[PDB]
Ligand binder design. Structure first.
Ligand SMILES: Cc1cc2nc3c(=O)[nH]c(=O)nc-3n(C[C@H](O)[C@H](O)[C@H](O)COP(=O)(O)O)c2cc1C
Ligand SMILES: Cc1cc2nc3c(=O)[nH]c(=O)nc-3n(C[C@H](O)[C@H](O)[C@H](O)COP(=O)(O)O)c2cc1C
Ligand SMILES: Cc1cc2nc3c(=O)[nH]c(=O)nc-3n(C[C@H](O)[C@H](O)[C@H](O)COP(=O)(O)O)c2cc1C
Ligand SMILES: Cc1cc2nc3c(=O)[nH]c(=O)nc-3n(C[C@H](O)[C@H](O)[C@H](O)COP(=O)(O)O)c2cc1C
Ligand SMILES: Cc1cc2nc3c(=O)[nH]c(=O)nc-3n(C[C@H](O)[C@H](O)[C@H](O)COP(=O)(O)O)c2cc1C
Ligand SMILES: Cc1cc2nc3c(=O)[nH]c(=O)nc-3n(C[C@H](O)[C@H](O)[C@H](O)COP(=O)(O)O)c2cc1C
Ligand SMILES: Cc1cc2nc3c(=O)[nH]c(=O)nc-3n(C[C@H](O)[C@H](O)[C@H](O)COP(=O)(O)O)c2cc1C
Ligand SMILES: Cc1cc2nc3c(=O)[nH]c(=O)nc-3n(C[C@H](O)[C@H](O)[C@H](O)COP(=O)(O)O)c2cc1C
Ligand SMILES: CC(C)=CCOP(=O)(O)O
Ligand SMILES: CC(C)=CCOP(=O)(O)O
Ligand SMILES: CC(C)=CCOP(=O)(O)O
Ligand SMILES: CC(C)=CCOP(=O)(O)O
Ligand SMILES: CC(C)=CCOP(=O)(O)O
Ligand SMILES: CC(C)=CCOP(=O)(O)O
Ligand SMILES: CC(C)=CCOP(=O)(O)O
Ligand SMILES: CC(C)=CCOP(=O)(O)O
Ligand SMILES: [K+]
Ligand SMILES: [K+]
Ligand SMILES: [K+]
Ligand SMILES: [K+]
Ligand SMILES: [K+]
Ligand SMILES: [K+]
Ligand SMILES: [K+]
Ligand SMILES: [K+]
Lengths: 207, 207, 207, 207, 207, 207, 207, 207
């Protein structure tokens, strides 16, 4: 396979829960192992914006998502917000790429300042120190200078700041096509195959 | 009325032409005067992503948009890319709020560095020097550090950086609902009434 | 009326609970709507420094303050520290001015770094991104370089840093006169009428 | 009326005394209250460059300017350089917009560094801390890096740096037309009506 | 004794003359030698805000304060604003701790930029270069970014920025108790004994 | 002769075409060789603000200016905006001093960022890299922080930023006297003799 | 002659009055015209450290120094501290090199921040803006970070910071030989001949 | 005793060998233990500028200086330039204050950048990391921006930059009195008694 075998996927409490669930589904379809993390605010966001009845506690959540995505047993690992015994908490862990999708301004802040108040923030801290892939998907508008300064610092350190800003150049017809555009870009960034978003210009030889 | 009587609306060559056309339509419905500017690349974007057959030259374009939006004669002014005799080129002009929607990375760059290679860039330069409202709506992902540095500099100077990043917290059902979310935020930023996006929590008294 | 119709008033755990309660009382007397927030540490401060027996939970607190200030029903809204459904959590809310009085060094830090760990911090983040008024009233001495750097960053972004540093130039006779001096300055900053602190020099025509 | 009711007008010792006197005259014609301040060096500049025989001391000066401009009694207040009992010395004063016209490099420096060695410098310090309008009209050439750094710092803090650099695009025929161009720009900046400088392009609908 | 034998106490023209006089009284009671300096504006502040009839010239002032505080002959030295022959003007002097209480924004500025326009400013310059204690007690609100930048630079260089911001956690009953809180903090900073403000938590062994 | 034998004189599209034409005339009278460059926008400015009927293309322009100024054949060279074969395009050229008068904000920006989109911008880039004289004459008001940052960067690198800000201290009687003041300052900066503006104080021996 | 025909020599209130008087004497012996300025504190320094009975007022001072140095009539011009009609106050003056010897920390500060509170500070401001030579001779120890920051800013702008730090490598036998070392370095910096300090290594051909 | 019991005294290859030898003599007279280090270039400087016939190797050097200063056996320790077994090489050593007198620009550079190419540079690195006193005595003129940047960085970190810049305010009569002035300042900085330089103003009670 091209791309990482294992992805830490963290969902935090920005609007755009559909992006995280769709990414999770695509990662599972590409036979990747997913270490799944979710903040308390992201649970509230998912309750508000989707019809997904996500259980509260990690093992029920794991059973639930494994069924929701059609994953294999053990393919989705779920870890709680203070579970320091999980692989993402230490750089001695097997290497994973990490994506925070969606990324709240509060989680962006914690990662930029090194905060490490829950396992999502610590996992990001580990990714940066180990020079492992870290993709942040912020969903906010306007962006203040505080947001922008935090994104710049992390981009300068090699994190990918991929805002939930879909393009329209493949004539989307539905909300799902817009969600898929952003998910495609994430997968492209990770180097994981996807066929939702064609390769621009691939056919074009001259002019 | 609340908000500005006159808006300079510039469309540049980022994906998201639908945002600009919908904003234009809403401004017209709120009886605002619109000074409309469009880059050569934005004309190509509109051709590619929409079914709008926009004429090339300013007076035909003006006739066209006035009909497309149901505007009054003279309500939409269209100015070409080197028309220095237009109001936006000088700070001695009557005050206008300016929005660049969508804003390409190239136009973001020109505005951040002071470039002033066409009338859109000069108009933004004027807005900043006169301390008139300037809203930029970038559409790009990932954002590089170059993008982020340009957005930060302008945000620090009081421009509003409003990325084309719609939220999902009012359960959008269509592409149009997502377009309207971003347009609503722009209008809110300008202080122009809108009823596409309710006031969050306005009903909520306690808990 | 001059000034904002609605104020988010956050009390955090610095010494100076009397400033917050007096501001609350003045806002109510000027017929403003107050969205009231209070941190867990600020509850402890109020217990220690005042004889106000503030209830713990938001609806009892609301009933209590509405009586304490002589407010109208619904004039004071109280929201808990994780109540994301409250207006201050989103920039799509109706516009409010925000004051954090008193402001602890910890809350100053969170606002400067974008932290957004409770509703006070998120509300401040929203005020900054929406370019709505934000006044911070820090109470600390000495100020370290960490404090000063945090205040500078926020001042440069257009927040008003109004330290709880009363003047003596209108010959205060009591603790209450000093409290009122600072409250007056806050109201002046917000553009809300007050008659506790005269307009300096207003009578003086020459010399 | 549009614009501020009260303006602090400070004249400092740069060449361009005619700009200050013409602004003073226009403010008086627009029925504004003017708190007038003048430095010792600016008195020497006015003696050298104009035929205005300005008295030395504040009450004689006030009597003099009230007659020179055709102002109402009390419309022009004159305050001496150490008169801390004047409104501009305290932020508890009634709000005023402040203009320093012309602004010497020495006064620019004092305002940028926070110096507060006379009432002009203190008044500027107050305007900045209260977020009241502050317009500086420097007259110098070349500008050194020291000048430019001082202007940048103040511009970044929201002061308007309006150099005494008239334009020629309304075909000036006299020294007075050039003086009026700069005065017009100041009034435009303050939001005070003026009809010396037309609104650029106001007639132009297309091309 | 603990703490410095000699303190340079400078009073400058911020509101809060009571803090300086109370500190002076406490230093005298702790048998310290005080080199007392006072600015022209601080003389005006003391006239306005207090009933202390301070003589204008240094020897009469010295006689006056020695009586006002019950000091020993020679215990309070008073030096004029251009007296370069006084100990504080040279780093070859015997070591002293220096406090500027209250500190105006103008004096803060001079010390941060190295100005050295009177003996207070030069004495501060000397303290910094000799790495002798320097405590500044600013009294201002709001603080602008200019103030904050000046305080930060000096804090980074090891000056103590101690704003006149009293706490309420020992239930003050009078203006005097608030004045004493700030004076206590200054003495604590200098390492001089005081019994106005108890040692927080000194009794508390667990929980 | 004192001063440079050859000057590259670039006119760009700021108001103040009269300054460029008067400088050109003075350079010709001082028997200097002038490499003359003019932007497309500056052609429009000259059409609008002056009665000079400047031809469009370089050889007709050259014939025209040689007659307008009374120059010798070959004394004024005119080069088009993409003429890379002209001396100013390479640092291997014979040394010239360069003046951009007037300098638009857009040209200021290009020079500060190194843009090199036409021969004026490239010529400035060459002057800086070769450490040859470069004088910029901006005409704009207000100056934004973007302008000021661009001017500062270039001043720090040894360019002379000479704003079109005439003084009044030699009692100008006409628009021409103000134009001549700025032209005089440019010539002084270049070290070229001029007798329009006397040497200040040259007669004054004492007091 | 090599070097400047005219030197502005400013003496300020640092220890090292002997350096200024010796430089003055050497400039006179090299037939240079000297525009001499002296601060009030430097007058006190000269009284304290030397046996030179310098008169207080500019014309008596001029008569005095012309005799003390054996100068020609008119060769030394003396200008008072507020004499704006003197050549050094304007950049339109004939070009001069400027030396501040000795330079106090207070004058260093004023020049670095652009202060322009007397004619010495303004003259330095003019030298920098006109890119005329400016040499500062500070005498202080230790140097604080404030001093060092001020010297760095001015050095980066092309001022020469020449501390009064004599070398011993030509085996000085007297205080005068040390004074002459520093004076020699100043003259070398200005490009004025001197034969007090030989050219190091001038005889040495190999090894 | 007041002050440190042990001083690391490093001599490097700036002019001013007399300062180092005189400091060494004074430290010995105050019964301090001296860890003496000397660079290869400083040996050449001492040969050139003094009549001291310093032996090359550490034990002969030690015998020599112990006799030259009248020290006790073991009071002066001499360590070679690569002797890592000496106390100054490790922060686990007993605490010492360190002085580099004189300090060359090359040694200043090494200390500012952390170089640690000989035992002098490493000893300074250790002093900084352990927060032990470090005094640098540079002898150079002019100071370039490189020097000044290096001194600033170290001053900001709490090193004392004490340039070899003697004052004249105690009317020196000989080269030795100037050497003693600088040595006095060093001892004052270290807190070691000295009676070469009186305490300025110690007698002065008023005026
Ligand atoms: C429905 C809902 C939508 C939200 N949308 C956003 C959003 O788009 N962006 C954002 O930064 N915060 C948003 N928030 C707020 C955060 O959830 C909040 O600041 C929280 O503290 C983030 O915590 P976390 O980073 O641990 O997930 C939203 C909250 C709710 C309830
Ligand atoms: C179909 C199409 C879509 C594009 N989408 C984007 C985009 O989303 N963001 C962007 O920065 N540039 C995009 N570009 C590229 C720009 O149009 C291009 O860089 C151009 O130079 C911008 O010029 P302008 O700023 O004058 O409009 C797109 C171009 C095309 C043709
Ligand atoms: C009685 C009391 C007084 C306090 N006074 C202050 C104060 O003046 N300034 C401050 O920054 N913190 C003070 N604190 C500490 C804070 O309350 C503490 O750091 C807390 O974490 C702040 O949390 P918050 O910002 O959520 O309110 C005080 C705490 C108590 C109990
Ligand atoms: C006739 C005259 C013209 C002056 N022109 C200027 C000028 O154009 N720009 C400037 O910065 N200073 C100029 N100055 C110098 C200042 O007046 C001087 O630096 C003074 O210290 C400024 O003090 P102030 O800022 O309190 O007015 C001029 C002085 C005189 C006498
Ligand atoms: C009654 C009175 C109260 C003042 N209060 C303050 C104050 O609280 N803070 C401040 O920075 N300046 C205040 N000022 C202004 C200063 O005194 C003024 O800016 C002055 O130039 C400071 O000079 P100094 O630093 O030499 O004392 C006050 C002045 C007066 C007369
Ligand atoms: C009549 C006229 C006057 C102008 N005046 C100015 C001006 O004073 N300052 C400025 O920066 N731009 C001014 N402009 C705008 C510029 O000409 C424009 O931004 C252009 O892109 C500059 O291009 P250039 O730098 O290649 O000349 C003016 C334009 C016109 C037509
Ligand atoms: C005898 C004497 C010696 C002084 N020596 C110095 C000195 O070496 N360095 C210094 O910066 N200030 C020294 N000062 C202090 C200044 O003179 C003082 O800070 C003054 O404000 C400087 O003003 P000026 O820059 O206008 O000359 C000395 C003062 C006196 C009286
Ligand atoms: C006689 C003599 C005098 C010197 N004077 C100085 C001086 O005053 N300042 C300086 O930085 N370097 C001076 N140098 C140069 C240095 O000694 C040289 O740059 C050397 O590399 C410094 O090495 P060090 O730092 O290991 O001692 C002098 C050299 C010699 C021989
Ligand atoms: C949870 C854990 C073992 C953390 C230590 O990880 P690492 O050495 O900091 O990468
Ligand atoms: C097109 C035009 C008249 C530009 C000059 O505008 P401004 O004086 O720079 O605001
Ligand atoms: C609680 C909530 C709906 C947060 C989203 O607000 P916004 O789009 O970030 O201003
Ligand atoms: C002259 C005076 C009362 C200054 C105090 O004003 P403020 O509290 O600093 O705005
Ligand atoms: C007033 C005086 C002797 C100043 C010189 O002091 P220092 O050498 O700069 O500490
Ligand atoms: C037009 C030309 C030959 C450009 C190369 O010039 P240079 O080597 O960059 O100074
Ligand atoms: C004293 C005087 C005429 C100052 C103006 O000089 P310049 O135009 O600022 O160089
Ligand atoms: C020569 C030596 C033992 C160096 C180690 O010292 P340290 O642990 O770095 O202070
Ligand atoms: K959590
Ligand atoms: K274009
Ligand atoms: K909380
Ligand atoms: K004055
Ligand atoms: K004073
Ligand atoms: K062009
Ligand atoms: K003076
Ligand atoms: K060596």
């Amino acid at each position: 396979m091209s791309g990482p075998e294992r992805i830490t996927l963290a969902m935090t409490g920005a609007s755009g829960a559909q992006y995280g669930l769709r990414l999770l589904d695509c990662l599972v379809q590409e036979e990747r192992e997913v270490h799944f993390l979710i903040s308390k605010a992201a649970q509230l966001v998912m309750a508000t914006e989707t019809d997904v009845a996500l259980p509260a506690k990690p093992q029920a959540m794991q059973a639930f998502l494994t069924e929701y995505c059609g994953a294999a047993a053990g393919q989705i690992r779920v870890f709680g917000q203070n579970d320091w015994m999980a692989p993402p908490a230490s750089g001695s862990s097997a290497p994973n790429a990490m994506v925070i999708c969606p990324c709240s301004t509060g989680t962006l802040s914690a990662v930029a300042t090194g905060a490490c108040n829950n396992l999502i923030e610590r996992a990001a801290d580990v990714a940066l120190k180990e020079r492992r892939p870290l993709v942040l998907v912020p969903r906010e508008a306007p962006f203040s200078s505080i947001h922008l300064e935090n994104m710049l610092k992390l981009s300068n350190l090699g994190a990918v700041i991929l805002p939930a800003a879909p393009g329209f150049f493949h004539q989307p017809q539905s909300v799902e096509d817009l969600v898929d555009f952003v998910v495609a870009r994430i997968l492209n960034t990770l180097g994981i195959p996807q066929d939702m978003l064609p390769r621009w210009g691939e056919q074009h030889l001259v002019s």
